[PDB]
Amino acid sequence: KETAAAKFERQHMDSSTSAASSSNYCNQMMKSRNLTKDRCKPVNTFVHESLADVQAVCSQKNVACKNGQTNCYQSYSTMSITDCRETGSSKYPNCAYKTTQANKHIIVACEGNPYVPVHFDASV
Numbered sequence: 383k384e385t386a387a388a389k390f391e392r393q394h395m396d397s398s399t400s401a402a403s404s405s406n407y408c409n410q411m412m413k414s415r416n417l418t419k420d421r422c423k424p425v426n427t428f429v430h431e432s433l434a435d436v437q438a439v440c441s442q443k444n445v446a447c448k449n450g451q452t453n454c455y456q457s458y459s460t461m462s463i464t465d466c467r468e469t470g471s472s473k474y475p476n477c478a479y480k481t482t483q484a485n486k487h488i489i490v491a492c493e494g495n496p497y498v499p500v501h502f503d504a505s506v
């Protein structure tokens with residue numbers, strides 16, 4: 383089984399590297415984290431920070447979520463992340479991704495008790 387917090391960890395956390403490794407990073411990560419089983423997720427972001435630093439975001443700047451809900455929080459500092467975005471020729475089952483490294487503020491939705499991240503909303 384997988385709790386909501388565990389799913390966020392599997393889908394968005396990669397503390398191992400301080401930044402995306404090779405240009406093949408996304409293709410490999412989207413595959414190993416089971417993010418292309420039923421379809422190709424159009425976009426997925428991986429965070430290269432410790433879990434504690436990401437969990438701490440739930441006690442930072444409260445802001446509105448893209449879906450209108452208000453349980454989203456923006457990080458005060460910028461974090462190291464990798465955006466994985468499909469290429470123009472990507473088509474299930476052969477999902478392919480462009481790897482883009484970046485340093486930006488992250489916005490996640492938190493829920494639960496403990497109040498932890500369960501959804502990655504955006505980067506700014």
Ligand SMILES: Cc1cn([C@H]2C[C@H](OP(=O)([O-])OP(=O)([O-])OC[C@H]3O[C@@H](n4cnc5c(N)ncnc54)[C@H](O)[C@@H]3OP(=O)(O)O)[C@@H](COP(=O)(O)O)O2)c(=O)[nH]c1=O
Pocket residue numbers: 386389393425426427428447448449451452453454465491492493500501502503504505
């Ligand atoms: C834009 C963008 C998107 N993504 C990623 C983020 C999403 O994956 P994701 O895996 O992070 O999305 P999810 O909806 O599956 O979130 C996992 C669970 O979180 C719950 N939840 C709780 N609070 C909220 C709020 N406030 N908004 C949205 N969702 C919320 C939700 O109901 C789910 O419950 P279950 O499905 O029952 O497990 C995906 C879609 O892009 P969308 O444009 O629709 O947001 O792309 C990313 O990784 N990076 C990006 O830059």
